[PDB]
């Protein structure tokens, strides 16, 4: 059975005049493990993975600005904004070296931070991550029409802001197993107020698809280029059929990325953590152990 509870004391830190919430558990010494969620989730997505890692490592899991229990300033919530606030978050906790565990838009943040801070990243575990999507044919068929509608301002905002489709529709459709009502309520909580749903709409409009938006495409291409030339230890989780990362792409990346271990979690779409948390957690913990082995 998969846990529905969120048994983590809230921690808060001031970041650029706002307050961000984060999970902070595990020993106080050693290399911390920073967990970064994406759209439309929160640190909640890591709730059943962290317990595998916390016995040996500090686990830090922030809620992105505008999401989870973090503050909700009147921003456009561009990727730029998230980058700014996450940089400031990392510096506010005085983190030096880290291991990254990243997912979805959290992966874009993680890879972009790593590229710019290569000496401070001691390993990256990732799953269903942001890469350039050259054309719409390389976006999953079943979600193609939806995300094309998301990527408009009248109808997309109607769907995502007014009707909360990303939470009620897209979110559970990103999990093979059914989310329980308790789980749904945790994911719903930060967005009960419609006006707070801005990040949920901007994020799919920031996705690097078919060359647009060009700035994001460029940035993502840059950190993928960096990732392909980096010797940093890498752990890739993938599922079938996946969403951002289909099996063929995972198979390619497992070989093209230096020093990369790949793990098949079985059936999965986007929120792999919700379909097979125990395997992901366990493999991350053991893989973390292997990072201390010289060979």
Does position 129 interact with Cl ion (CB under 5 A)? The reply is no
Does position 204 interact with Cl ion (CB under 5 A)? The reply is yes
* The two structure tokens encoding residue 293: 């082995």
Among the listed residues 77, 113, 187, 203, the single contact to Cl ion using CB under 5 A? 203
Strands ordered across the beta sheet of 33-36: 11-15, 18-25, 59-62, 33-36, 98-104, 121-129, 234-241, 260-268
Q: CB neighbours (10 Å) of residue 94?
A: 6
Are 238 and 224 a contacting pair, CB within 8 Å?
no
Stretch of residues binding Cl ion (CB under 5 A), selected from 32-40, 78-86, 254-262, 264-272: 32-40
Cβ closer to Cl ion: 58 or 103? 103
Q: How far apart are CA 19 and CA 241, in angstroms?
A: 37
CA distances from 289 to 27, 28, 55, 120, 292 (A): 15, 17, 12, 18, 6
* The two structure tokens encoding residue 272: 């792999």
- Shortest Å distance, C-beta 181 to Cl ion: 24
Site string for Cl ion, 177-196 (x = CB under 5 A): --------------------
How many residues interact with Cl ion (rule CB under 5 A)? 3
- Shortest Å distance, C-beta 230 to Cl ion: 25
Among the listed residues 26, 39, 85, 208, the single contact to Cl ion using CB under 5 A? 39
Does position 79 interact with Cl ion (CB under 5 A)? The reply is no
- 3-class state of residue 236 by DSSP: strand
Stretch of residues binding Cl ion (CB under 5 A), selected from 68-76, 169-177, 202-210, 226-234: 202-210
Which residues would be at the binding site for Cl ion (CB under 5 A)?
A: 39, 203-204
């Amino acid at each position: 059975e998969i846990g529905t509870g969120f048994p983590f004391d809230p921690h808060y830190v001031e970041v650029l005049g706002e307050r961000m919430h984060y999970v902070d558990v595990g020993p106080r010494d050693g290399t911390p493990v920073l967990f970064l969620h994406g759209n439309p989730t929160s640190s909640y997505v890591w709730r059943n993975i962290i317990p595998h890692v916390a016995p040996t490592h500090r686990c830090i899991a922030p809620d992105l600005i505008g999401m989870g229990k973090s503050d909700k300033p009147d921003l456009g919530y561009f990727f730029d904004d998230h980058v700014r606030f996450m940089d400031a978050f990392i510096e506010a906790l005085g983190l030096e070296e880290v291991v990254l565990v990243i997912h979805d838009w959290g992966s874009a943040l993680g890879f972009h931070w790593a590229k710019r801070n290569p000496e401070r990243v001691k390993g990256i575990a990732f799953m269903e991550f942001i890469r350039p999507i050259p054309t719409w044919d390389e976006w999953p068929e079943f979600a193609r029409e939806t995300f094309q509608a998301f990527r408009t301002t009248d109808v997309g905002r109607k769907l995502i802001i007014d009707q909360n489709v990303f939470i009620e529709g897209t979110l559970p459709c990103g999990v093979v197993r059914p989310l329980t009502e308790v789980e749904m309520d945790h994911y719903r909580e930060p967005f009960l107020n419609p006006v707070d749903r801005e990040p949920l709409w901007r994020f799919p409009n920031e996705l690097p698809i078919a060359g647009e938006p060009a700035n994001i495409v460029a940035l993502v291409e840059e950190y993928m280029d960096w990732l392909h030339q980096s010797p940093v230890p890498k752990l890739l989780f993938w599922g079938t059929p996946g969403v951002l990362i289909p099996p063929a792409e995972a198979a390619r990346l497992a070989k093209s990325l230096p020093n990369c271990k790949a793990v098949d979690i079985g059936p999965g779409l986007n929120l792999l953590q919700e379909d097979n948390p125990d395997l992901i957690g366990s493999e991350i913990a053991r893989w973390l152990s292997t990072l201390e082995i010289s060979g």
